[PDB]
Design a binder for this molecule. Structure first.
Ligand SMILES: *[C@@H]1O[C@H](CO)[C@@H](O)[C@H](O)[C@H]1NC(C)=O
Ligand SMILES: *[C@@H]1O[C@H](CO)[C@@H](O)[C@H](O)[C@H]1NC(C)=O
Ligand SMILES: *[C@@H]1O[C@H](CO)[C@@H](O)[C@H](O)[C@H]1NC(C)=O
Lengths: 48, 43
């Protein structure tokens, strides 16, 4: 009924309504870096 | 009489699907290359 990964988290389950196996892929994410001049000059910033 | 069990006697310790991994577990297993009694069903 359940599968597990190396980290012991769930990788896939069998749908209790339709006997198919569904993969769980974590939603896209990533770091955000801010490039800015000092507040003593300007309050305009860029986002990376 | 005894024979060589080779690598028999390994079963899944639980009901979780696992794949592509080397898993170390402690459970009741048949020792490898252990002696198992050989029985006959003739005469
Ligand atoms: C309800 O469960 C039954 C039992 O397997 C299954 O055949 C059927 O697809 C399920 N209904 C729905 C709407 O998934
Ligand atoms: C702050 O700004 C002033 C004038 O805009 C300048 O004279 C001073 O050197 C600046 N200091 C720093 C730490 O940027
Ligand atoms: C199996 O039995 C043979 C002879 O009967 C003996 O030499 C051997 O050590 C035994 N092996 C095991 C794993 O008990």
């Amino acid at each position: 009924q359940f599968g597990r990964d190396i980290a012991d988290t769930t990788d896939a389950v069998r749908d209790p309504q339709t006997l198919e196996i569904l993969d769980i892929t974590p939603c896209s994410f990533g770091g955000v870096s801010v490039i800015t001049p000092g507040t003593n000059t300007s309050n305009q910033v860029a986002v990376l | 009489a005894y024979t060589n069990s080779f690598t028999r006697g390994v079963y899944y310790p639980d009901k979780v699907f696992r794949s592509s991994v080397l898993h170390s577990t402690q459970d009741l297993f048949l020792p490898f290359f252990s002696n198992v009694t050989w029985f006959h069903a003739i005469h």
